[PDB]
Every structure is written in structure tokens, then in C-alpha cells.
Amino acid sequence: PQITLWKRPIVTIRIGGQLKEALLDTGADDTVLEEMNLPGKWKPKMIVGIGGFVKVRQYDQIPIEICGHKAIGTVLVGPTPANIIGRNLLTQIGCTLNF
């Protein structure tokens, strides 16, 4: 698709058989989803947030479908105010910025 920016670029994603809404986010390096359980081993991780670091859980090699495009990559889980899809997965689905 082509997604304009008059409104927040939010799309439906599918992960672990669950459907969620997530923000296509070119200013984030990583993909961060709200608190949830995923299958497998995870590592503790700190990401740079407002007023300090935010603690998240890192899951690697997770299949995730983004607006019907398949990715397999790293998903961070934690207390984000919004589900965000970052560059690690935007590149996998062939997403560019254009003007």
C-alpha cells in the first residue's frame, strides 16, 4: 500500500495468532509492543525513554504479519503507550519513505 500521514499510520498486525493495531514508526530503531506473553526465551533489555531507560523483554526471530506482509524478527515487549513497528521490521516488509 501507500500510507499517507494526515492521520497516524496505524495498521493491523498478526502475532501469535493475535490481532493488534500498531503504529508504523520510522523514528524507532526497534519494534515495541504493549505487555503480552510470547512463546520462548527472552532477554531483559533497556531502551532509551523519556526521563530515563524503559525495561522491556526481547524476543528474537518472532514471526509477525504487518498489513499482510510477513516478517521474522526481534520484538520488544513492555510498557509502551502504543504498539510501534520500527525500522528492524519496516525494512523486512520493504517499507520506504517517499516524497
Ligand X SMILES: Cc1c(O)cccc1C(=O)N[C@@H](CSc1ccccc1)[C@H](O)CN1C[C@H]2CCCC[C@H]2C[C@H]1C(=O)NC(C)(C)C
Active site residues: 25
Looking at the chain, the residues that come just before a C–N gap of over 2.5 A are none
d(CA 70, CA 85): 13
Rounded distance between C-alpha atoms, residue 48 and residue 12, angstroms: 26
By CB under 6 A, residue 97 contacts ligand X: no
E strands, 9-51, where? 10-15, 18-24, 32-33, 43-49
Is 9 a binding residue for ligand X by CB under 6 A? The answer is: no
Among 19, 50, 96, 97, binds ligand X (CB under 6 A): 50
**Phi/psi of residue 38, nearest 5 degrees:** -120, 155
Question: Does 80 participate in binding its own copies (rule CB under 8 A)?
Answer: yes
Q: Which does 67 bind (CB under 5 to 8 A by kind): ligand X, its own copies, none?
A: its own copies
Q: Applying CB under 8 A, which residues contact its own copies?
A: 1-6, 8-9, 23-29, 32, 47-54, 67, 69, 79-82, 84, 87, 90-91, 93-99
Q: Applying CB under 6 A, which residues contact ligand X?
A: 25, 27-30, 32, 47-50, 54, 80-82, 84, 86
